[PDB]
Every structure is written in C-alpha cells, then in structure tokens.
Ligand binder design. Structure first.
Ligand SMILES: *[C@@H]1O[C@H](CO)[C@@H](O[C@@H]2O[C@H](CO)[C@@H](O[C@@H]3O[C@H](CO[C@H]4O[C@H](CO[C@H]5O[C@H](CO)[C@@H](O)[C@H](O)[C@@H]5O[C@@H]5O[C@H](COP(=O)(O)O)[C@@H](O)[C@H](O)[C@@H]5O)[C@@H](O)[C@H](O)[C@@H]4O)[C@@H](O)[C@H](O[C@H]4O[C@H](CO)[C@@H](O)[C@H](O)[C@@H]4O)[C@@H]3O)[C@H](O)[C@H]2NC(C)=O)[C@H](O)[C@H]1NC(C)=O
Ligand SMILES: *[C@@H]1O[C@H](CO)[C@@H](O[C@@H]2O[C@H](CO)[C@@H](O[C@@H]3O[C@H](CO[C@H]4O[C@H](CO)[C@@H](O)[C@H](O)[C@@H]4O)[C@@H](O)[C@H](O[C@H]4O[C@H](CO)[C@@H](O)[C@H](O)[C@@H]4O)[C@@H]3O)[C@H](O)[C@H]2NC(C)=O)[C@H](O)[C@H]1NC(C)=O
Ligand SMILES: *[C@@H]1O[C@H](CO)[C@@H](O[C@@H]2O[C@H](CO)[C@@H](O[C@@H]3O[C@H](CO[C@H]4O[C@H](CO)[C@@H](O)[C@H](O)[C@@H]4O)[C@@H](O)[C@H](O[C@H]4O[C@H](CO)[C@@H](O)[C@H](O)[C@@H]4O)[C@@H]3O)[C@H](O)[C@H]2NC(C)=O)[C@H](O)[C@H]1NC(C)=O
Ligand SMILES: *[C@@H]1O[C@H](CO)[C@@H](O[C@@H]2O[C@H](CO)[C@@H](O[C@@H]3O[C@H](CO[C@H]4O[C@H](CO)[C@@H](O)[C@H](O)[C@@H]4O)[C@@H](O)[C@H](O[C@H]4O[C@H](CO)[C@@H](O)[C@H](O)[C@@H]4O)[C@@H]3O)[C@H](O)[C@H]2NC(C)=O)[C@H](O)[C@H]1NC(C)=O
Ligand SMILES: CCCCCCCC/C=C\CCCCCCCC(=O)OC[C@H](COP(=O)(O)OCC[N+](C)(C)C)OC(=O)CCCCCCC/C=C\CCCCCCCC
Ligand SMILES: CCCCCCCC/C=C\CCCCCCCC(=O)OC[C@H](COP(=O)(O)OCC[N+](C)(C)C)OC(=O)CCCCCCC/C=C\CCCCCCCC
Ligand SMILES: *[C@@H]1O[C@H](CO)[C@@H](O[C@@H]2O[C@H](CO)[C@@H](O[C@@H]3O[C@H](CO)[C@@H](O)[C@H](O[C@H]4O[C@H](CO)[C@@H](O)[C@H](O)[C@@H]4O)[C@@H]3O)[C@H](O)[C@H]2NC(C)=O)[C@H](O)[C@H]1NC(C)=O
Ligand SMILES: *[C@@H]1O[C@H](CO)[C@@H](O[C@@H]2O[C@H](CO)[C@@H](O[C@@H]3O[C@H](CO)[C@@H](O)[C@H](O[C@H]4O[C@H](CO)[C@@H](O)[C@H](O)[C@@H]4O)[C@@H]3O)[C@H](O)[C@H]2NC(C)=O)[C@H](O)[C@H]1NC(C)=O
Ligand SMILES: *[C@@H]1O[C@H](CO)[C@@H](O[C@@H]2O[C@H](CO)[C@@H](O)[C@H](O)[C@H]2NC(C)=O)[C@H](O)[C@H]1NC(C)=O
Ligand SMILES: *[C@@H]1O[C@H](CO)[C@@H](O[C@@H]2O[C@H](CO)[C@@H](O)[C@H](O)[C@H]2NC(C)=O)[C@H](O)[C@H]1NC(C)=O
Ligand SMILES: CC(C)CCC[C@@H](C)[C@H]1CC[C@H]2[C@@H]3CC=C4C[C@@H](O)CC[C@]4(C)[C@H]3CC[C@]12C
Ligand SMILES: CC(C)CCC[C@@H](C)[C@H]1CC[C@H]2[C@@H]3CC=C4C[C@@H](O)CC[C@]4(C)[C@H]3CC[C@]12C
Lengths: 324, 316
C-alpha cells in the first residue's frame, strides 16, 4: 500500500539491440543490430527504496510480449566460471548433457526482470546459493538502490546524494565529482563542463571526461558482475575507439543522445537536470568447447543501453527559489 | 530437542599454528610457529552436522586459549582491492583504520566466528558482505558432507546399511562441489575383523603438493595442503620453522569394505594456508617473505566399534 512519488520525476528508459543476423555472426560476418526502445519505467520512492512502474503510453511496445534476440549471458558466465576452475566438473558435464545456443530469444520483461535459465537451475540443484534466475535487473525492483555523489578538490568533501538527497562550501569549477553505484564496486569521476541555467536556477554541468587490448572508452566490469563477461560503454560506443563502432553494424553515436551529464545547483547541491546514460556489452570470442560459437569474431557485443533522467519543472523550480 | 548420534562416531580435531615471531616476520625473517591442539569436537546428526566440544579430549578451553595468526579478513579485502573489487572503499578504510597483518583471537573466535572491524565497515555499504569471519563460520548445524563415487555412490553427505576392486578409483566432491580429488587403492587392511581396502590421495596431485582454492573461497588467498606440507615440495617446509611432516600423522586415508562399500575407518587430514606476499600499497605487509603460511590443520576421523562391526559381519 506504500511507495510515494519522488520530489522530482525520475524515469529509466531501456533500449535493446535486437540481433538481426545470428547465423551470419556464427559464420564470421559483422553483426547487424536493430535498436528497440524506449521501454519507459517511472521511478517511485517510499532507508530509501525505488520501484519501477511501466508506462505503456510512453513506450515502443509491451515488454511482456515484445521479444529480443541477443546473447545467452548465463551460459557465457558459467563458461567463465568453468575456466577459472569454479565448478568445472559439473558445469562441463551439464553443458555436454544439455546443448545450449549462443544467441537466445526472450521477452523484454524476461531480460530485464528475470527468466529461469536451464543451466543455472541445474547448478542450483547442487549449489542452492546460486540463483536459477537471470535478468539484467533481476531482484533490483523494490531495493535501496541509488548512486552516491561526492565532492572533491584539495583538502573539501561534500556529499550530494547518499542513495537519494534534496532539501557550507564555495563549490568551484576546480572540484571533481566522484560517483559510485549502489554496490560501490568502482567509481567514475565527472568534471566540470560549463555554467548552465536550469528553469532559471544556476547550475554547473558535469560530464565524464575524455581521460577515462582492450580499447579506449570501454570499462571491463567483470569482477562486479559475478565473473560474467560484461564490458561497460556509453550508448552506441560514444567517446570510445572507432574500432568498437565499425565492429557492430547498427551503432551510430552522437553526443546529444548518448552523452552523460548532471547539472547541479552549487548553493544547494541539488541535481536539477541529468542523464545517466550507459550500455551493457558482452565480450564475445570464439571458444574451444560447449558452444556453438562457430567462427564468431572477437568483439564487444552490445546488449542494451539505458537513460535514467530527471528535470525540474517550472513550478518546483520557482517553489525552490521561493525557499531562499 | 533434535540432533541424534551418527551410526559411526565422527570427530573433528583442530590443530592451530601459533605465530611466535610476528614482528620478526614483518622484518623479513623465517616464521616460527608452534602447534596448539587438539580441540576435539564430536559430530552430531539430524543430513545436517553439529559440532559438540569435548574438553576431556582437548588441549585446553577454546573460549579462553588464544592464537596469534594472520588477519585473513584484511588479507582477503587486500586481494579484492587488487582485482579491482571495492578498491576505492577498501583502500580508504584501511587508511582510516590501521589494521595489523598478525592478530590474536580465542580458538572459538577463529573457528566459529568474530566480528571484523573492516568487514563491519564494508557491511554498511555492502549488506551482502558478512561482518563476521571464521574458518568454520555458519558451518554448525548445516547439511555439510562429502560425496564419494566409483559408477556407484558410496556417501552422499553420509551412507551405511558396491563390489569394489583394487583397480577402481574413488572420486570425491566437497558439497560446495568446487573441486574434486581422486583417491586410489594403497593396500589391503582389516578393520575390526572386516576386510578393507586402504585408499590414499596419490602423488599425481606455485609448487607441488599444494592446492590454490581462492575461487572456492570468495577470492580470499587460501592454499590447501596436507598437514605440515606432507607430500608437498621441500621448499614449503623449509619456508616455515615449525613444520615437521610424517606419514603416520599427516596422511589422508579411507578404509572401505570391498563388499558393501562401507567406510570402516578414515582420516580427512588437510591444512588451511594463506598465500602471503609483500605489497607496497599496503604498509600492513611490511617486508614479509612471499610464502604459503600455515593457519591450522584438522583431522576428521571415523572408526567402526567392536559391536557395530560384529553386527555388520552378522549381516552376511
Ligand atoms: C590463486 O588463484 C588466484 C585466483 O584464481 C590467483 O589470483 C590472481 O591474483 C592476482 C593478484 O595480483 C591478479 O592479478 C592482478 O590483476 C590484473 C591481472 O594481471 C595479470 O594480467 C595482465 C594481463 O592483462 C593486461 O593485458 C594487456 C597488457 O599486456 C592489456 O589489455 C591490459 O593492460 C590488461 O590489464 C587489465 O587491467 C584491467 C583494469 O582496467 P579496466 O577494468 O578496463 O579499467 C583489469 O581489470 C584486467 O583484469 C587486466 O589485468 C598482465 O599484464 C599482468 O602482468 C598480470 O599477469 C592486473 O591489473 C593487476 O596488476 C598489478 O600487478 C602487480 C602485482 O599484482 C601490482 O603490484 C601492480 O600494482 C599492478 O596493478 C594484477 O596483476 C590475477 O588477475 C588473479 N587471477 C585471477 C584468476 O583472478 C592467484 O595468482 C593464485 N595464487 C597463488 C598463490 O598462486
Ligand atoms: C527481435 O528480433 C526477433 C528475431 O527476428 C523477433 O522475434 C520474432 O518475432 C515474431 C513476431 O514478431 C515471432 O513470430 C511468431 O511466431 C509464432 C510461432 O510460429 C508458429 O507458426 C509457424 C507457422 O507460421 C510454425 O512453423 C512454427 O513452428 C510455430 O508453430 C507465430 O505463432 C506468430 O504468428 C503470428 O504472426 C503475426 C504476429 O507476429 C500475426 O499477425 C499472425 O496472424 C500470426 O498469428 C509469429 O509469426 C518469431 O517467433 C520471433 N522469432 C524468434 C527467433 O523467436 C522479434 O519480434 C524482434 N523484436 C522487435 C520488436 O523487433
Ligand atoms: C533519455 O535518453 C534518450 C537519448 O538516447 C532520449 O531519446 C532521444 O530523444 C531525443 C529528443 O529528446 C531524440 O532526438 C530527436 O530525434 C528526432 C528523430 O530522430 C530519429 O530519426 C532520424 C531521422 O529523421 C534518425 O537519424 C535518428 O536516428 C532517429 O531514429 C529528430 O527529428 C530530432 O531533431 C530535432 O532536434 C535536434 C536537436 O539536436 C535539432 O537540431 C533538429 O533541428 C530537430 O529540431 C532529434 O534529434 C532521439 O531520437 C531519441 N532517441 C531515442 C533512441 O529514443 C530521451 O528523450 C532521453 N530523455 C528523456 C527524458 O526521455
Ligand atoms: C587425528 O590426527 C592426528 C594426527 O595429526 C592424531 O594425533 C596424533 O596421534 C598419534 C597417535 O594416534 C600421535 O603419535 C604418537 O605420538 C607420541 C608422542 O609424540 C610426540 O613426541 C615425540 C617425541 O617423543 C615427537 O617426535 C612427536 O612429534 C610428538 O610431538 C609417540 O610416543 C607415539 O609413538 C608410538 O606409536 C608409534 C606408531 O608409529 C610407534 O612406532 C612407537 O613405538 C610408539 O609406540 C606416536 O608417534 C601423534 O603425536 C598425535 N599428533 C597430534 C598432533 O595430536 C589423531 O589421533 C588422529 N586420530 C584420531 C582418531 O583422533
Ligand atoms: C567466480 C565467482 C563466482 C561466485 C558465485 C557466487 C554466487 C552467484 C549467484 C548467482 C548469480 C548467477 C548468475 C550470474 C549473474 C551475473 C551478474 C549479472 O546478473 O549481471 C547483469 C547485471 C548488470 O548490472 P548493471 O549493468 O545493471 O549495473 C551497472 C553497475 N556497475 C556500475 C557495477 C557496472 O547485474 C545486475 O544488475 C545484478 C542483478 C542481480 C541483483 C541481485 C541483488 C538485488 C539487491 C539486493 C539484495 C536483495 C536480493 C535478494 C532477495 C530479497 C528478498 C527476499
Ligand atoms: C571477488 C569476488 C568477491 C565476491 C564477494 C561476494 C560476497 C562475500 C560475502 C562474505 C564473505 C566475506 C569474508 C570472506 C570470507 C572468505 C572465505 C572463508 O571464510 O574462507 C575460510 C573457510 C575455509 O574453508 P574450509 O577450509 O573449511 O573448507 C575446505 C573446502 N574446499 C574443499 C572447497 C577447499 O571457509 C569456510 O569454511 C566458509 C565459512 C562460511 C560458510 C557460510 C555458509 C554456511 C552454510 C550454509 C548456508 C547457511 C548460512 C546462512 C545462515 C542460515 C541461518 C539463518
Ligand atoms: C575482464 O576482466 C576479467 C576479470 O577481471 C578478466 O578475466 C580473466 O579471464 C581469463 C579467462 O581465461 C583468466 O585466465 C585464466 O586463469 C585460470 C586460473 O588461473 C587458468 O587456468 C587459465 O588458463 C588457460 O587459459 C589461458 C587463456 O589465456 C591460456 O593462456 C592457458 O594456457 C590455459 O589454457 C587462464 O590463465 C583470468 O585469470 C581472468 N582474470 C581474473 C582477474 O579473473 C578478463 O581478461 C578481462 N576481459 C577483457 C575483455 O579484457
Ligand atoms: C599463542 O601465542 C600468543 C602470543 O604470544 C599467546 O597469547 C598471550 O597469552 C598470554 C597468556 O598466556 C596473555 O597474557 C595475559 O595478559 C593479560 C592481559 O594483560 C593478563 O591479565 C595475564 O596475566 C597473568 O599472566 C599469567 C598467566 O598467563 C599469570 O601467571 C599472572 O599472574 C597474570 O595474572 C596474562 O599476562 C597475552 O595477552 C597473550 N598475547 C597476546 C598477543 O594477546 C597465547 O596464549 C598462545 N597460546 C598458546 C596456548 O600457546
Ligand atoms: C516493481 O515494483 C512495483 C511495486 O511492487 C510494481 O508496481 C506495482 O505492482 C502492483 C502489482 O500488484 C500493481 O498494483 C501496480 O502495477 C503497481 N502499483 C503501484 C502503486 O504502482 C512494479 O510493477 C514492479 N515492476 C516490475 C517491472 O515488475
Ligand atoms: C553447534 O551446534 C550444536 C547444536 O546447537 C551445539 O550443541 C548444543 O548447544 C546447546 C546450547 O544451548 C547446549 O544444550 C549443548 O552444548 C549442545 N546440545 C547438545 C544436545 O549437544 C554446539 O555447542 C555448537 N557448537 C559450537 C562450536 O558452537
Ligand atoms: C559507467 C559509466 C560510463 C557511466 C557514468 C555514471 C553517470 C552516468 C552517473 C553517475 C552519477 C549519476 C547521477 C546520480 C544521481 C542521480 C539522481 C537520480 O534521481 C536520477 C539520476 C541521477 C541524476 C544520475 C545521473 C547520471 C550520473 C551522473
Ligand atoms: C584438499 C585435499 C588435499 C583433501 C582430500 C579429501 C579426503 C581427505 C577425503 C575424501 C573423502 C573423505 C571421506 C568421505 C566420507 C567420510 C565419512 C564421514 O562420516 C567421516 C569423514 C570421511 C571418512 C571422509 C574422510 C576424508 C576423505 C577420504
């Protein structure tokens, strides 16, 4: 019966890359992908937990019907496990007993929130700690998720958002912002881009700088993701080596749609407007046994990208300025 | 009100290596250890194990007796820092809260659990990470137990009431199913009158005779060995003063009745070690030598009694 509406409306939109030529990929050709999206989810805040409410009117189609053909992330994870000698004996045996495919078709809702994987369910009979369920956002609905932004510079360390924060120092263009995810695995630092105004209020625009085998502009986030072969990128390999783009037909990056930014009011430390824009990729290579990978090229294969956005409205901006 | 006595009495005895020269180790000298034990625990069952302490069959009280050995939680988190898992947080709190590489705790604290300062801190950020550490933490009362295969099954956590030949090999799984070990026929034995086959871990299984198990242990730097580096490279022994291996006390064996497949008598004898090396980013380590440092070894033993043996022979 709980879950309230946040002070500023936050929305996460998912965009999936549908694999149009799977048999052609296995025979060594360049992948051809087709971007399907958005699948708009409105955030809700009740500690502080968030819930995702689907908005069909603001989405491309129904995620409970719409199918996406992409890579089988569970088998590549359990293969990676096999290699580092974690459950090799079992994993090998069931991958031999139950032939799995590299390319798999599922509903958007199945990829996003969860599906029961054949091989994982088998592993679970032995290891009850290993979930049979897989999803890019599995069990993330209703949990105390939320990034952490910190201020730096010289000595100065101001916290702007600890899971979530709204309504002192001289914040300057010289200060850097350190951002951690819910899980604190790795950090990303965003530096001052320029001075902006947001619904009249002054703001400093922060952007991920150019300063951040394999190739530039991608982040191997494998340790944070239970050994799953996951690479991080900006949507469409924006700000990443040209090689990454040319590798996958369907990628067309541009700054206006694929950049990450966050406009913060200095005085208050309030985020007035922002866009969390990142892409999940899978590092795919040709492999000796179990799959069925064929003569696949070694590449950073895109699965899906998202946009987590917020924008202060005309009213709440003039109500915030009224509280001064 | 539950927990019954197993059909054959099983006992786990713990033996700890007490570090006599910690400051000397940090300055680069050879470690000097002193073996403290046994701490005898009688196993209880009702598929789930339960360890009951036997003071009368032990060296001292584990709730009083202290052991000075390595801070496994700091060594683990340092290893996480390196593989770039929570580098930023781990580094920051190791800087804010100066930790020692050598730490003193009660036997019961090392065995069943203690709250670690750094893990408690990490738990504030990562609720999925336990603040509690113990070599056997949360293992009391759980459905633990090995699996022994021939393709007939002798075990499956535990088994009693299979025609084995000297040619057959036995495959063993540890329940966590991480890795396997195979035991081959050593010789012919008699156990309480019953014929048996003595099965031993062969010579066929960093340096030889040690097993790296970091993946099975949440990235914690853990090496497995036989007690006192028995059947392992001499270099391993010479590295640590205090190690004196011998077959009679440190070998692992298992006497199986050829007809029924029943284990009549056996010794599960293994040692937990930590791979410790000197690191420049962690002042904690000093100028420590790169070595496979022993923490503790155990003996999980079973032996059929005069009565149950003559009751088993009666069923023939
Ligand atoms: C028991 O078993 C365990 C577990 O099974 C064994 O664990 C091993 O523990 C070590 C701990 O030090 C760990 O190594 C560390 O991790 C990285 C791997 O280093 C090795 O591999 C390097 C090859 O990768 C590089 O290759 C190209 C250059 O030739 C190029 O593509 C890259 O530079 C690439 O480096 C990468 O860097 C990224 C970080 O960037 P992003 O995430 O994209 O932002 C890493 O994520 C990625 O993993 C990769 O390494 C090779 O060059 C190197 O020489 C090693 O052979 C290194 O980053 C670490 O580097 C550090 O090495 C020194 C010593 O540790 C440090 O003092 C120094 O500061 C430096 O930073 C480091 O080597 C193993 O990965 C880990 N293995 C597993 C399976 O987890 C353990 O060894 C066993 N113990 C015993 C007792 O035997
Ligand atoms: C992402 O890319 C993937 C891969 O191309 C797309 O997935 C395909 O999506 C279509 C629907 O758009 C799926 O097609 C459906 O197949 C069903 C199963 O086939 C049966 O029927 C044939 C005979 O016709 C038998 O030979 C076969 O064995 C099965 O018994 C059909 O039931 C569906 O039929 C209906 O089609 C349309 C609606 O799509 C109706 O108008 C018709 O009247 C008819 O009732 C349908 O053809 C197909 O299965 C998917 N492929 C895979 C690999 O699963 C994604 O849709 C695409 N997503 C986006 C949004 O681009
Ligand atoms: C969350 O993040 C995503 C960013 O990835 C946003 O979605 C994008 O939204 C922008 C607008 O907010 C869209 O941009 C506009 O696209 C129009 C059509 O583009 C399609 O068609 C062209 C061919 O005609 C293709 O080349 C292209 O690939 C698209 O498929 C354009 O007509 C628009 O042009 C107008 O604006 C520009 C501004 O730079 C002017 O210069 C022009 O003159 C013109 O007036 C514009 O480019 C974008 O297409 C959306 N992408 C996706 C994938 O959905 C979300 O909106 C963002 N934020 C929120 C809150 O939702
Ligand atoms: C679980 O596993 C451990 C093995 O680590 C067992 O504990 C050992 O038990 C054996 C006996 O079962 C002990 O061996 C005996 O030790 C006596 C004293 O040894 C100490 O002192 C000598 C010097 O006097 C040192 O060299 C040595 O390192 C010890 O510190 C000896 O007097 C015994 O000798 C007798 O038996 C041998 C058998 O080979 C005969 O040849 C001799 O003639 C003589 O009669 C014997 O060696 C051993 O010390 C114990 N070790 C520890 C660390 O406790 C558990 O018993 C085992 N099983 C069960 C079910 O618990
Ligand atoms: C060799 C070592 C092996 C170790 C094995 C140990 C046991 C493993 C058990 C199960 C896993 C099996 C399947 C493998 C899963 C692979 C990981 C995965 O799935 O990778 C996909 C996504 C990608 O991440 P991303 O791009 O979204 O994030 C970006 C975040 N950055 C910044 C860190 C990059 O990972 C996600 O999203 C995560 C989705 C799952 C989240 C679960 C936790 C939910 C939150 C709180 C706890 C409560 C849950 C329990 C139930 C409570 C109610 C009863
Ligand atoms: C880079 C990747 C990082 C991933 C991080 C993921 C989250 C990690 C979370 C917490 C761990 C933090 C502390 C680090 C612990 C290091 C591991 C450890 O501690 O290493 C010590 C001992 C050594 O093992 P060993 O020599 O004895 O075995 C020999 C077995 N071989 C044959 C496989 C070699 O490890 C043991 O013993 C294990 C002791 C703990 C056992 C807990 C499970 C108990 C059983 C069943 C589940 C029920 C528990 C929950 C409560 C239920 C009631 C409410
Ligand atoms: C992204 O980061 C991940 C994790 O940080 C990183 O993972 C590395 O993957 C390889 C997978 O093969 C691991 O290397 C193996 O380690 C085991 C255990 O020690 C060995 O048995 C393996 O040996 C075989 O395979 C080798 C393949 O090169 C052969 O050379 C060898 O002869 C054997 O046949 C192998 O050495 C490696 O340990 C992990 N690292 C970690 C930290 O887990 C991955 O490389 C990064 N991905 C990208 C896209 O850069
Ligand atoms: C393993 O090695 C460690 C490290 O050497 C060793 O720990 C030490 O144990 C002694 C006790 O044996 C501890 O000393 C005690 O310290 C407290 C606190 O100050 C005092 O109250 C005690 O005083 C009594 O000391 C004698 C008895 O020990 C009495 O005769 C006397 O009258 C005093 O009342 C006592 O000094 C010491 O704290 C630890 N060291 C560390 C680092 O904690 C451990 O006991 C060894 N274990 C075995 C079984 O070998
Ligand atoms: C995420 O969790 C929220 C909260 O549980 C879900 O939203 C509610 O779901 C119930 C299901 O009975 C329905 O009444 C409504 O659809 C939602 N209620 C409100 C008040 O919004 C949400 O659907 C979950 N998201 C996903 C993807 O499963
Ligand atoms: C392991 O668990 C068992 C079972 O809970 C413990 O043994 C019992 O503990 C209760 C505690 O109130 C006492 O009645 C007795 O000491 C035990 N009862 C029986 C019937 O044996 C055991 O102590 C635990 N071991 C450790 C090391 O904590
Ligand atoms: C892995 C790399 C390439 C991605 C970089 C992380 C970027 C996209 C993150 C780090 C911190 C993030 C911000 C942190 C806080 C919030 C408040 C929330 O209510 C909406 C999203 C918003 C406004 C985020 C927008 C995007 C942001 C700036
Ligand atoms: C890590 C390596 C070096 C250790 C090798 C594993 C050895 C020690 C294992 C494999 C199978 C095991 C046996 C399997 C079954 C039982 C029955 C149980 O009621 C007591 C322990 C006992 C009798 C085990 C003793 C030790 C044993 C022989």
């Amino acid at each position: 019966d709980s879950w309230e509406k946040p002070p500023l409306p936050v929305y996460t939109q998912f965009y999936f890359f549908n694999v149009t030529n799977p048999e052609e990929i296995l025979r060594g050709e360049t992948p051809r992908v087709e971007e399907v999206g958005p699948y708009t989810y409105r955030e809700l805040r009740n500690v502080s937990n968030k819930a995702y409410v689907f908005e069909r009117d603001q989405s491309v189609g129904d995620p409970k019907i719409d199918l996406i053909r992409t890579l089988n992330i569970p088998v590549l994870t359990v293969i990676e496990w096999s290699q580092v000698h974690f459950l090799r004996e079992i994993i090998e045996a069931m991958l031999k007993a139950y032939q799995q495919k590299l390319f798999v078709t599922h509903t958007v809702d199945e990829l996003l929130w969860g599906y029961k994987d054949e091989i994982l369910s088998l592993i679970h009979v032995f290891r009850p700690d290993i979930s049979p369920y897989f999803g890019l956002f599995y069990e993330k609905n209703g949990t105390n998720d939320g990034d952490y932004v910190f201020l730096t510079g010289e000595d100065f360390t101001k916290i702007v958002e600890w899971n979530g924060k709204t309504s002192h120092p001289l914040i300057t263009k010289d200060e850097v912002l350190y951002v951690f995810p819910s899980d604190f695995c790795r950090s990303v630092y965003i530096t001052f881009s320029d001075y902006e105004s947001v619904q009249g209020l002054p703001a400093f625009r922060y952007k991920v700088p150019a300063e951040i085998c394999l190739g530039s502009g991608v982040l191997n986030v494998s340790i944070c993701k239970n050994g799953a072969p996951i690479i991080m990128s900006f949507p469409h390999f924006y700000q990443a080596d040209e090689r990454f783009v040319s590798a996958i037909e369907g990628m067309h990056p541009n700054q206006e749609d694929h950049e990450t930014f966050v406009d913060i009011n200095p005085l208050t430390g309030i985020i007035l407007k922002a866009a969390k824009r990142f892409q999940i990729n899978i590092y795919v290579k040709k492999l000796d046994d179990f799959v069925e990978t064929g003569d696949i090229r070694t590449m950073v294969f895109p699965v899906m990208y998202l946009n987590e956005s917020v924008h202060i409205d005309k009213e709440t901006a003039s109500r915030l300025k009224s509280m001064i």
